[PDB]
Amino acid sequence: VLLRAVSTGLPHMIQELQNHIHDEGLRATSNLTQENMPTLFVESVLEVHGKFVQLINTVLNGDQHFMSALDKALTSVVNYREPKSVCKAPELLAKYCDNLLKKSAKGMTENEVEDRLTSFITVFKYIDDKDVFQKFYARMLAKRLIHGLSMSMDSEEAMINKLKQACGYEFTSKLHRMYTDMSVSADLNNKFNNFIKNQDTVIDLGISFQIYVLQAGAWPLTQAPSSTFAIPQELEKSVQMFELFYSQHFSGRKLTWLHYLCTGEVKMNYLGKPYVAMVTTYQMAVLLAFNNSETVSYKELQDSTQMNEKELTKTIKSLLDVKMINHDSEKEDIDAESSFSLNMNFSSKRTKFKITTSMQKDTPQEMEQTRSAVDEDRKMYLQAAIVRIMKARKVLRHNALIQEVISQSRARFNPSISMIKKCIEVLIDKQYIERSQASADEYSYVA
């Protein structure tokens, strides 16, 4: 009442409302979840944001001086903290979103979660991280989409929309295609069967048959060479035969190769009750070895396989550390024999822990390894960001740009202010009117 009655006080509130809200923003959002459980960090962002907004909820009664301070405060919370990495909240948000979006981590009732996500978006309005969040989430989502362990499809889409109204298009669009990719792809698998191998009558050996479009539009991944795999008949009939019908499916929508969808589900009646399960890659070869002989020696075998050994260091670490796999002999350079043992293991050693098997490392570790690359991508993103910003105005005065970029670069991605003159003079010099020198009148002419 006083600060309203006396004129000058409110801008001070602009000052004060940012600082402690920011300060606790260091601890309560950032410092409080080092443990790095994603749910915890999201809750921490919620903690600072909600608590302080509630502070505002009082007699402050809106009064935008207060809210603007709050806007700056949260901007400071996510952005301004000691760690340069702004994406940590979105990193923990992405994982958490997947957690909410999957049946695995947290089971809840449908669309209540939407409500929770709604509150998340509300807090999210301040956050700048779409590169990590969108791409990395799409990446994790792609992996989980391969997994299929999801709470639901539509709610995921709802979360997408929550972002979508507010955010950039391709960020959403690629995911849309990824979603549709899976959907239409399942339809495609049905089609691929349905031409000759109808629902009832299939003229094929039959491994699980599912694949995606293998198109340029769907994926967030980068380029990494894989090893040379023999790819047997069932693998052939799943994919390659598909390539035949794929021409029938898409004539003109060409192929970007993706083996990763090779599907396998085993229904085996070894013991009275058909069991559907999933297992590793090597013993299958051993089974093949068994059909033909008892053993397949590594000399000819190695001669036959010739895997590209880029990844092998990580592979070796994983195979040696696991020791879950029934193998002949694991040696450093070359394993002399690959005619692996019988079904030695079941799900777990102990019940408290000592739980860990199927082979985990390839699965969550990829990003773990990729972080160097992703951060490099962050660097690239920033580079692209300056590029994206700097292209905007053809004829201007330099001062005119001021306070323009803030609209484009604040909330969506992390701001990069310092690059302006350098970017103009270095990048922009192509077909444009250049003011390298503002005083004199002259510059570049387009062809």
Partner 1 sequence: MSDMEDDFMCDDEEDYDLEYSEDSNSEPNVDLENQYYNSKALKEDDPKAALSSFQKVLELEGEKGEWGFKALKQMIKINFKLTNFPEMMNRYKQLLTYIRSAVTRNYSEKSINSILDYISTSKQMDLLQEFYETTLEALKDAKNDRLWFKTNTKLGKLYLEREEYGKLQKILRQLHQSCQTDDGEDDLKKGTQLLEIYALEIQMYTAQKNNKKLKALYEQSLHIKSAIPHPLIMGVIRECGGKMHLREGEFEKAHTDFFEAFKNYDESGSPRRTTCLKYLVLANMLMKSGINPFDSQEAKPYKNDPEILAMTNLVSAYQNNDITEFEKILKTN
Partner 2 sequence: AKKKRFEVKKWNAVALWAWDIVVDNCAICRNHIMDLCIECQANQASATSEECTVAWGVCNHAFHFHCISRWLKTRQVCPLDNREWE
Note the residues at the interface with partner 2 (CB under 8 A): 143, 146, 207-208, 214-217, 219-224, 226, 234, 254, 256-266, 268, 270-271, 275, 277-284, 286-287, 311, 340, 342-343, 346, 362, 366, 431, 446-447
**9/206 with CB nearer partner 1:** 206
Q: What does the per-residue mask of binding to partner 1 show for 192-231, with x meaning CB under 8 A?
A: -------xx-x-----x-----------------------
Number of residues written out for the chain: 447
| CA torsion through residues 199, 203, 205, 211, sign | negative
Using CA atoms, how far residue 344 sits from 133, 205, 326, 341, in Å, is: 42, 28, 7, 8
Geometric angle at alpha carbon 425, from 422 and 429, rounded to 5°: 145
Q: Which two tokens stand for residue 108?
A: 């809840």
Decide if residue 184 touches partner 1 (CB under 8 A): yes
**250/432 with CB nearer partner 1:** 250
**161/226 with CB nearer partner 1:** 161
Say if residues 151 and 110 touch (Cβ distance below 8 Å).
yes
Q: Which two tokens stand for residue 351?
A: 């019940």
| DSSP states of 268-290 | E-SSSS-EEE---SHHHHHHHHH
Stretch touching partner 1 by CB under 8 A, among 270-278, 299-307, 316-324, 360-368 = 270-278
Which residues lie closer than 8 Å to 433 by C-beta, 6 or more apart?
Answer: 394, 395, 443, 444
From partner 2, partner 1, none, which one binds at residue 298 (CB under 5 to 8 Å depending on kind)?
Answer: none
Shortest Cβ distance from residue 244 to partner 2 (Å)? 19
**58/347 with CB nearer partner 1:** 347
Residues 148-177 that bind partner 1 (CB under 8 A): 150-155, 157-158, 161, 164-165, 176
DSSP single-letter state for residue 131: I
Q: Which two tokens stand for residue 408?
A: 């484009």
**174/435 with CB nearer partner 2:** 174
**31/363 with CB nearer partner 2:** 363
d(CA 184, CA 182) in angstroms, rounded, equals 6
**292/347 with CB nearer partner 1:** 347
Q: Which two tokens stand for residue 46?
A: 């919620």
From partner 2, partner 1, none, which one binds at residue 220 (CB under 5 to 8 Å depending on kind)?
Answer: partner 2
Shortest Cβ distance from residue 89 to partner 1 (Å)? 24
Name the nearest CA neighbour of 401 among 413, 415, 417. Answer: 417
d(CA 122, CA 16) in angstroms, rounded, equals 23
From partner 1, partner 2, none, which one binds at residue 234 (CB under 5 to 8 Å depending on kind)?
Answer: partner 2
Name the nearest CA neighbour of 96 among 27, 171, 43, 32. Answer: 43
Positions in the binding site for partner 1 (CB under 8 A): 103-104, 107, 109-112, 114, 150-155, 157-158, 161, 164-165, 176, 180, 183-184, 199-200, 202, 208, 249, 251-253, 265-267, 273-278, 347-348, 351
